[PDB]
Amino acid sequence: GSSGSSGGTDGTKPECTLCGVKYSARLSIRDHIFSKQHISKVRETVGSQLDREKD
Ligand SMILES: [Zn+2]
């Protein structure tokens, strides 16, 4: 016989893979991104310091 295969994943749980800060059933993506906690990661992940030569 046959067991069966999978052809579609689902699981957009409220989390921030970027800051690894899994939001709580209550918390929300907004409340997060709207907190230094997140911003910081967004400032470091790339950096604040400007580039040598500007465009
Ligand atoms: Zn975040």
Swiss-Prot record:
What are the start-end ranges of the zinc fingers (C2H2-type)? 14-38
The record's account of tissue expression is: Expressed in brain, heart, lung, muscle and small intestine. No expression detected in undifferentiated P19 cells, however, expression was seen following retinoic acid treatment to induce neuronal differentiation. Expressed in undifferentiated C2C12 cells, following induction of muscle differentiation in a low-serum medium, expression levels were decreased.
Where, subcellularly, is it found?
Nucleus
Q: Which family, according to UniProt? A: Belongs to the krueppel C2H2-type zinc-finger protein family.
Annotated function: May play a role in neural and muscle differentiation. May be involved in transcriptional regulation.
Protein name per its UniProtKB record: Zinc finger homeobox protein 4
What is the organism of origin for this protein?
Mus musculus (Mouse)
- List the range of the whole protein covered here: 2937 to 2984 of 3550
